[PDB]
Design a protein around this nucleic acid. Structure first.
Lengths: 158, 99, 114, 139, 144, 56
RNA sequence: UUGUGGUAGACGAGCGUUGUAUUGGAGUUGAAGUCAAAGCGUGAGCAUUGGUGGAUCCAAUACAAGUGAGAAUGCCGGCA
RNA sequence: UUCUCGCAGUCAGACAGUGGGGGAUAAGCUUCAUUGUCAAGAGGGGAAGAGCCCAGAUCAUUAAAUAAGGUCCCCAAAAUA
RNA sequence: GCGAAACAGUACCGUGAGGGAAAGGUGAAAAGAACCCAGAGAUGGGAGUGAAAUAGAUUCUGAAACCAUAUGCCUACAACGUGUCAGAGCACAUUAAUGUGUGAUGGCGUGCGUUUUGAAGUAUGAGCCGGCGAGUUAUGAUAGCAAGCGUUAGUUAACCA
């Protein structure tokens, strides 16, 4: 800004006896070289605050929308087995689900090595925890698989 | 030969087999329209109008006059209101006339 | 987040500059003088939209009264001949349109007594 | 035929170059070299080089007889000038510019061949207008 | 919308007329002069073109003013020089150039127009009665 | 003096219209064939039939 | 039906620009920039086409603005 | 045009008529109340015009009719006694 | 963008503290035009290479202001902040449109912005183009709209995961 730019206060001309434009400082925002009064600064915060209850209501609504998506059927811990990281197997899984561009983010609460083993190569497939869910992430899925043990936690959480 | 036919608020000299442009009638293309208002075809002028005299004209197209850009402003008054007027019209011609 | 904004500036100046053309001298060369001329001409046309009919009605009455004085009678009685007796809806310009067709306006100016 | 010959920025002011070459437009090289060798102007002797270079161009690169060749076009294209300063009185300083001239000379053989350029621009115009046309007949 | 109107253009036809100032007065002939030169009495008028016709006035040197205007009303003609005023009266232009009398009268009562200054030459004025323009085969009519 | 208003392009053109130059005379030298200027010397030097200057 | 002068001044609906979140599309088979033209719009604009041009851009929904120059005896650089 | 909320702008006016004050009832003067206008409102008439008379203009119309004002030519419109 | 993409605090300025700049991009790879012609010369025209040289070192793109050239049109008695509404004539054909280009002439025609009681003014600012360029934020208060919760209500801070 006008004070941040390095420079002095010397005036190239005196204040009278010349029809030149009035100048008062070495650097000015209206003078070349820079010195804009207001621009980007590392203080802008974008702070927002929403009550916990309202956010939980928004959650419950978006889950219920997802729970009625009719294309997100139930999945069991057993089927994550029989493979360690062979995405080819998971590619056959994805094909069998008739999903091509579905940004499938998988909810996990077992931390079974097989899934975070995969789902880090292609941008399409990722796996994230139930405790880390976000509304955009939930609707970013457009297709998802839910594990049945966490249904108990979901009904407990209303 | 000649005829004196008023469309809307505008009265026109119209002869037989002449294309011309009048105010908008919102008439779609193709059909034949018999207008009532007419005066002094060639003789025997009726006072307000010509009684029972019809002018039977065919409409062929609706057009618009060139883009008229109009700006209102007063000097040193911070007022530069700009607008664009389009002037619709109907281009048509007459085919028949009856007394 | 810097934005120069000289592109849409170029577009807006270009779109002010097309209509300002065909003028004598550098009037249609620079942004400011060209816009001044365009606005002034717009005002001139706005006022002339009235001035044209104001002068054309005078042209009508003068052209009619030329022939009227040729036949001696005046415009003052002419309106009486039409509007009062044998009421008609005749307008000024069609009179001269009939004058420009020989031997027709004579019939109208002669039925004034009938 | 063009017979264009460029110079690219010899140090002369273009005002004087145009000034000296109004006198050559439309004339024949037979009566051009002589008048260029007699008129006592700085640019006169300097453009004789370009004139004879154009003669050589016409005689060698194409090789027509050239007896009907006439001076088609002179021009003094304005190049980037040089900037200098000189001290003046009261401590002031005068600012001076050095103007050079890009010179290209064209020799024509027939009083024609611009009209051909006119129909070439018209061909551009038509390719434009039917290019617009195909936008509508496209289904 | 509007009724299209047309006028004659670049096909004007003009004639020669004869008129005499035997017992006339300045104003009552000058009004007819303006009327004829304008052509406002004929339906062939076009402001974009010429409308008047040739006119010949003959023997302007017997026109008479009513009242003492010939002796007391004066015209000053100032040249571009300082003190270039030529003072003339009604009585003196009879024994002098009366042609300029009708000339300045007719020019004063018409708008400053390039056609009007071109119009004014279509009328010819001489205090005499003989002129080589007599061979124009002209239409003769009084009070013109 | 000092200008008050800027001079227009067409005033520059009209002042330059009389600021041009005309052509020059020309003649033929019989002995030394050359299109020389009238009443001057030739390429070989003979203004008339007289050439006292060196031919080099 | 009332209408439709208008500074100050107040109210409402707005447009373009960058990048981001997506859903999409196009791109050496020549993107965008560029100018020329006798377009479409109540408006900021939106275009149509050719050449030039030689590589990313665009439609819609939202998001946050070094987001919008005719003037500052303005500055920068050129032309005068 | 009442009441509350929010934003105001603004306190440099002048002109024309009356009543006045001052001057010298002098001012394109100064200051008021009242009657209108300009500021912040086009236009027509007045030779142009910041206010005077007619007057409050969405856009278009080589449409008609009126207000003030005008009808010897410019400059459009009349004569009769 | 640190002033400083580049040999920058460099050049340069004042003796001294101190002050203080500007400018990059060729093309795939120089493969950077062997050789010929003109001209001493740079240079230009060829050839050849390069897809392409109108990519040839001025070396990504090259608006406009600026300067010229010319198709056609108009113009040397003319009183004009230069255009508008009509408009013949002249030359034509398009984002097919009551088509376009120019305008002999007629009617009309005292700028932009700011200042203000009010400015075509002889009140001021502007030779000109272009490029940039001056209503944003930390906290809190008031008012307005919408949403959430709900009249034993509602909301959290700091901090941690």
């Amino acid at each position: 800004t006008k004070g941040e730019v390095r420079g002095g206060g010397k005036k190239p001309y005196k204040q009278k006896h010349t029809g030149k434009a009035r100048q008062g400082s070495t650097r000015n925002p209206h003078f070349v070289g820079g010195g804009i009064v207001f621009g980007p600064k590392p203080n802008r915060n974008y702070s927002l605050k929403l009550n916990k209850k309202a956010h939980t209501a928004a959650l419950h609504t978006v889950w219920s929308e997802k729970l009625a998506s009719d294309n997100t059927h139930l999945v069991d811990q057993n089927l994550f087995n029989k493979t360690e990281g062979k995405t080819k197997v998971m590619m056959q899984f994805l094909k069998s689900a008739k999903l091509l561009d579905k940004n499938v983010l998988f909810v996990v609460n077992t931390l079974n090595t097989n899934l975070e083993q995969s789902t880090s190569n292609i941008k399409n497939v990722q796996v994230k925890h139930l405790d880390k869910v976000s509304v955009r992430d939930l609707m970013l899925a457009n297709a998802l698989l839910v594990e049945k043990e966490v249904l108990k936690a979901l009904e407990g959480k209303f | 030969m000649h005829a004196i036919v008023v469309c809307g608020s505008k009265q026109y000299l119209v002869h037989e087999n002449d294309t011309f442009f009048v105010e908008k009638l919102e008439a779609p293309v193709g059909k034949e329209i018999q207008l009532d208002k007419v005066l002094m075809l060639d003789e025997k002028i009726g006072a307000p109008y010509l009684e029972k005299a019809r002018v039977v004209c065919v409409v062929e197209k609706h057009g618009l006059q060139r883009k008229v850009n109009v700006i209102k402003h007063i000097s040193q008054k911070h007022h530069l209101k700009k607008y664009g007027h389009r002037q619709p019209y109907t281009k048509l011609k007459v085919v028949r006339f009856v007394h | 987040m810097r934005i120069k904004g000289g592109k849409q500036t170029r577009v807006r100046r270009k779109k002010w500059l097309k209509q300002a053309s065909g003028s004598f001298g550098t009037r249609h060369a620079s942004y400011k003088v060209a816009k001044q001329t365009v606005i002034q001409a717009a005002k001139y046309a706005y006022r002339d939209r009235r001035n044209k009919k104001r002068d054309f009605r005078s042209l009508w009455i003068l052209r009619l009264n030329a022939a009227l004085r040729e036949q001696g009678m005046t415009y003052s009685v002419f309106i009486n001949l039409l509007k009062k007796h044998n009421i008609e809806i005749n307008r000024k310009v069609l009179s001269e349109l009939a004058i420009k067709e020989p031997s027709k306006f004579n019939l109208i100016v002669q039925k004034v007594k009938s | 035929m063009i017979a264009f010959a460029k110079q690219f920025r010899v140090r002369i002011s273009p005002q004087k170059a145009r000034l000296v070459c109004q006198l050559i437009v439309g004339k024949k090289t037979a009566d051009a070299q002589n008048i260029l060798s007699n008129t006592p102007k700085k640019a006169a002797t300097l453009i004789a080089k370009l004139l004879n270079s154009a003669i050589a161009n016409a005689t060698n690169n194409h090789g027509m007889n050239g007896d009907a060749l006439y001076v088609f076009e002179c021009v003094a294209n304005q190049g980037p000038s040089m900037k200098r300063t000189i001290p003046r009185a009261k401590g002031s300083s005068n600012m001076i510019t050095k103007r050079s001239s890009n010179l290209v000379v064209k020799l024509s053989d027939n009083p024609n061949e611009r009209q051909e350029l006119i129909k070439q621009q018209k061909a551009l115009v038509k390719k434009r207008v039917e290019g617009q046309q195909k936008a509508k007949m496209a289904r | 919308k509007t009724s299209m109107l047309t006028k004659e253009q670049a096909n004007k036809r003009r004639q020669w007329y004869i008129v005499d100032a035997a017992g006339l007065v300045l104003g009552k002939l000058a009004v007819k002069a303006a009327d004829l030169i304008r052509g406002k009495n004929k339906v062939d008028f076009t402001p974009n073109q010429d409308c008047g016709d040739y006119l010949i006035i003959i023997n302007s040197d017997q026109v008479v003013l009513t009242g003492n205007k010939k002796e007391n009303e004066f015209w000053y003609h100032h040249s571009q020089y300082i003190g270039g005023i030529k003072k003339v009266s009604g009585r003196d232009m009879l024994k002098k150039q009366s042609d300029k009398l009708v000339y300045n009268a007719v020019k004063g009562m018409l708008p400053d127009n390039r056609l009007s200054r071109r119009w004014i030459t279509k009328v010819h004025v001489f205090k005499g009665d003989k002129h080589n323009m007599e061979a124009q085969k002209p239409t003769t009519l009084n009070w013109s | 003096a000092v200008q008050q208003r800027r001079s227009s392009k067409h005033r520059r053109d009209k002042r330059r219209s009389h600021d041009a130059l005309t052509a020059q005379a020309l003649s033929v030298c019989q002995k030394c064939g050359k299109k020389k200027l009238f009443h001057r010397v030739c390429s070989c030097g003979m203004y008339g039939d007289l050439r006292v200057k060196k031919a080099y």
